[PDB]
Amino acid sequence: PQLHNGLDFSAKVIQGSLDSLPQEVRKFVEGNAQLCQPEYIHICDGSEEEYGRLLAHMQEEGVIRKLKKYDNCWLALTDPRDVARIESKTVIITQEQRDTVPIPKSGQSQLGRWMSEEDFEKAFNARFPGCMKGRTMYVIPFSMGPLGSPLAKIGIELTDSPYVVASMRIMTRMGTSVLEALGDGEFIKCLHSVGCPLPLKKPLVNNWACNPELTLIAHLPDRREIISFGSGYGGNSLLGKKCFALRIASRLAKEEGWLAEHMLILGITNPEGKKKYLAAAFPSACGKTNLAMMNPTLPGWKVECVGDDIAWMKFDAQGNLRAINPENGFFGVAPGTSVKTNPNAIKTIQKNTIFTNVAETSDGGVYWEGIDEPLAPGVTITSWKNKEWRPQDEEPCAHPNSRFCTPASQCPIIDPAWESPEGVPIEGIIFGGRRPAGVPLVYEALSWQHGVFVGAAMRSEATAAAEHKGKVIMRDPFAMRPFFGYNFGKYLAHWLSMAHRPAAKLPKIFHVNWFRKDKNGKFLWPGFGENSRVLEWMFGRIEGEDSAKLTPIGYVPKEDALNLKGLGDVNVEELFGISKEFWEKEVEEIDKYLEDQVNADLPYEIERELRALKQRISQM
Numbered sequence: 230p231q232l233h234n235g236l237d238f239s240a241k242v243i244q245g246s247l248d249s250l251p252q253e254v255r256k257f258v259e260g261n262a263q264l265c266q267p268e269y270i271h272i273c274d275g276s277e278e279e280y281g282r283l284l285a286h287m288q289e290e291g292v293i294r295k296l297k298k299y300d301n302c303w304l305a306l307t308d309p310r311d312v313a314r315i316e317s318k319t320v321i322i323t324q325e326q327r328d329t330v331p332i333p334k335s336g337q338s339q340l341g342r343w344m345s346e347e348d349f350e351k352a353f354n355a356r357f358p359g360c361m362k363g364r365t366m367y368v369i370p371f372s373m374g375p376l377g378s379p380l381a382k383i384g385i386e387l388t389d390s391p392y393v394v395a396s397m398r399i400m401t402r403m404g405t406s407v408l409e410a411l412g413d414g415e416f417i418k419c420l421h422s423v424g425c426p427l428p429l430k431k432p433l434v435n436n437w438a439c440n441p442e443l444t445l446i447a448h449l450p451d452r453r454e455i456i457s458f459g460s461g462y463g464g465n466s467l468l469g470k471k472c473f474a475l476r477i478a479s480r481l482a483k484e485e486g487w488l489a490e491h492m493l494i495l496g497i498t499n500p501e502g503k504k505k506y507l508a509a510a511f512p513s514a515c516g517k518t519n520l521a522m523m524n525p526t527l528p529g530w531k532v533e534c535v536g537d538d539i540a541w542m543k544f545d546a547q548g549n550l551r552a553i554n555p556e557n558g559f560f561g562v563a564p565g566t567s568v569k570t571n572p573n574a575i576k577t578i579q580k581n582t583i584f585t586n587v588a589e590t591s592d593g594g595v596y597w598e599g600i601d602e603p604l605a606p607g608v609t610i611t612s613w614k615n616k617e618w619r620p621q622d623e624e625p626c627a628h629p630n631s632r633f634c635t636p637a638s639q640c641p642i643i644d645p646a647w648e649s650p651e652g653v654p655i656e657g658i659i660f661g662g663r664r665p666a667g668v669p670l671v672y673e674a675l676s677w678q679h680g681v682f683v684g685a686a687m688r689s690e691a692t693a694a695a696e697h698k699g700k701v702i703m704r705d706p707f708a709m710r711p712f713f714g715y716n717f718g719k720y721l722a723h724w725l726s727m728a729h730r731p732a733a734k735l736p737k738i739f740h741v742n743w744f745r746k747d748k749n750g751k752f753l754w755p756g757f758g759e760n761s762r763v764l765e766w767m768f769g770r771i772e773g774e775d776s777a778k779l780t781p782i783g784y785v786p787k788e789d790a791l792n793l794k795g796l797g798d799v800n801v802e803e804l805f806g807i808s809k810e811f812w813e814k815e816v817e818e819i820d821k822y823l824e825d826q827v828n829a830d831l832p833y834e835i836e837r838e839l840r841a842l843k844q845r846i847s848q849m
């Protein structure tokens with residue numbers, strides 16, 4: 230069927246067979262092979278041997294180091310220019326801008342970044358032609374969600390990064406079995422390049438191929454494509470995670486009647502064995518992973534982890550909100566993780582785990598700020614910047630957004646239904662972020678509509694998960710500001726529409742604040758395992774216990790309803806204080822934000838809830 234060789238890159242296939250692929254997967258591979266011009270094509274099978282060999286190969290080349298203190302753990306140090314997400318270089322392409330983001334009155338949108346089809350094609354042509362010269366194109370078949378779940382979705386990621394291949398094996402279900410399950414079905418098309426064709430034009434910093442100048446993370450939902458160039462950092466290069474499972478999936482979810490959210494999923498069991506599942510949306514680096522696998526301090530209580538980051542949720546024909554974790558692993562913030570703060574994480578990351586931008590001890594272990602493990606005298610530390618480090622120095626040993634990438638199956642409290650194809654029934658949804666002032670430890674929304682407004686109103690101190698520096702309290706509706714796949718106003722309408730659904734059992738909505746501080750900047754709440762005390766209250770409220778007092782912002786715990794045994798030094802009045810002054814200002818600021826950023830796309834119900842909150846506050 231050809232006058233010469235065709236577009237047949239069969240000669241360059243070094244694992245698997247293009248003939249073995251489904252026809253559409255083959256076209257995707259060969260088309261991009263012709264564009265990117267890789268030397269070889271490696272069709273990933275996801276096997277232990279493939280993984281081990283690829284890791285040793287990376288080890289040979291000085292791309293990673295083996296951590297000799299642990300069972301099969303590895304360390305990658307990056308170019309300091311490629312350390313986190315970059316929201317300003319993250320774009321969604323649609324025919325109309327307004328389908329992607331509301332048109333902001335003030336001229337600049339805080340809700341996503343749109344690029345025209347025409348501008349994107351120019352950006353694409355300035356980057357990808359020949360970009361994989363001298364490198365292997367890896368073909369990664371992956372499933373988001375358990376294989377054969379009705380809620381699961383398959384993708385194919387093309388990459389020239391062995392680091393991406395290894396990390397995808399942990400964070401997704403990856404390999405031959407995914408291709409077999411896929412058959413001739415549709416798949417999300419994911420294209421990635423580090424953007425450093427050989428021979429190299431500039432020298433690599435720290436053996437980490439990247440192209441910060443041309444870095445662009447693009448989403449084309451109408452073509453079912455994700456196209457990411459120039460960054461190896463996980464959020465930008467593990468295309469199943471933020472790019473697919475939040476951005477693409479949120480819009481699909483809108484179209485099909487389900488939800489794709491930046492939420493942990495956990496099971497909480499009381500001392501008498503009664504169990505419920507909760508979902509929680511906190512902004513990046515605001516405590517989801519610590520909550521999802523919390524070691525509860527309250528005797529008798531148990532927490533089990535379903536997922537720590539992304540939730541796909543859909544009301545079943547019985548009206549239960551069913552959640553699955555679409556990921557296969559945890560891509561968790563390293564700094565702060567200790568036996569004290571997160572004992573279950575520490576046990577998970579003992580083996581089969583890839584660390585990125587943490588420090589290395591002289592005995593082949595890992596180190597970071599807040600690890601809370603003294604080292605023997607004589608043990609020295611290499612920083613994430615590959616230099617000798619002392620606790621003297623005014624510079625952290627690990628990068629603030631350094632990460633572990635670890636299999637979810639190893640979590641000692643992984644929930645028994647964490648791969649159930651039907652999902653787990655959600656009875657409560659928790660919103661929250663970092664608020665140093667004004668917002669009490671916990672409150673409960675008055676209705677679904679108020680609950681959606683509470684999600685929409687979320688604000689949170691900036692973190693190191695993206696490019697944002699300092700401690701400015703930013704707006705982060707639903708913890709989804711960096712991740713909306715479409716118009717935020719339409720997303721709110723979609724959320725509100727859940728109330729009108731066949732027999733839907735709407736979860737109770739809560740808002741929490743672990744991060745309230747006193748005059749001296751000291752946390753008023755110790756948090757971590759002590760947050761079990763907040764979860765107890767939520768549990769009883771879902772059961773219908775009369776443990777709530779009505780305030781202007783919603784229901785708070787009655788006096789003595791929170792179990793504070795073992796925490797008698799906690800200042801309850803300060804922690805739970807609601808100031809008319811603060812809240813007048815808060816509502817005014819929410820008003821102006823929504824009017825500016827959402828305007829004509831703002832649902833009536835949300836504006837109504839705003840008007841109601843304002844009125845309730847005026848009566849204080």
Ligand SMILES: Nc1nc2c(ncn2[C@@H]2O[C@H](COP(=O)(O)OP(=O)(O)OP(=O)(O)O)[C@@H](O)[C@H]2O)c(=O)[nH]1
Nearest residue numbers: 513514515516517518519562564565694743756757
């Ligand atoms: N003070 C306090 N700090 C916390 C608490 N929970 C988590 N943290 C810290 O906040 C940082 C980020 O927490 P994570 O649980 O990794 O945040 P995340 O929501 O999983 O972030 P992403 O994975 O980026 O979406 C870590 O350094 C934690 O130690 C808490 O209850 N109280």
Ligand SMILES: O=C([O-])C(=O)[O-]
Nearest residue numbers: 314464513514538694
């Ligand atoms: O990496 C993450 O999970 C994030 O940035 O939210």
Ligand SMILES: [Mn+2]
Nearest residue numbers: 491513514538
């Ligand atoms: Mn996240």
Ligand SMILES: [Mn+2]
Nearest residue numbers: 517518561562
């Ligand atoms: Mn996390």
Ligand code: NA
Nearest residue numbers: 292306435436
């Ligand atoms: Na390196």
